[PDB]
Design a binder for this molecule. Sequence first.
Ligand code: ZN
Lengths: 67, 122
Amino acid sequence: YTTPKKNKHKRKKVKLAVLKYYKVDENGKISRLRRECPSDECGAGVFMASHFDRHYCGKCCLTYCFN
Amino acid sequence: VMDVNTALQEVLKTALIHDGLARGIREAAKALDKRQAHLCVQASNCDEPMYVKLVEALLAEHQINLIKVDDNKKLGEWVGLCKIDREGNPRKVVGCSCVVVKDYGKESQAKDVIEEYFKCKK
Ligand SMILES: [Zn+2]
């Protein structure tokens, strides 16, 4: 009943209705956009994140920074 | 034309009751990029060109067969992606737009896609 903050909001997902992971050029080739994760489970599999400084894999949970 | 469309009906039915076949764009991409996937099935009534040019241009650079069906909704009813009661909705979901068969389960009705690949190579 003390209520110092009146709630705690819980996360809503981003809900963006597209992937946009691929590009095609001059009648099309496959074009990966991110550095492919070298993890054994998903090698040449799922893609890594593109943050402002680093890359990040959602499955294998490993990152590559560029200092 | 019955002996090909009903043929891959039986093929995808035995595939989904025997294992998991990929349903939807992301599992389709991640399943056909791996070098074990069999033929893809994708819809014809897509409303945007980058989706279709993506899926055909990205299956043609592999060595995998393709069969195209007219509507996505009735395909999604076919692919088991529903909650079908026998007296209610046939497809209460927006049907699937593209699948890929990872495995056939068994070799009962593989002759249909064999002659499909034959007429593709004709
Ligand atoms: Zn990974």
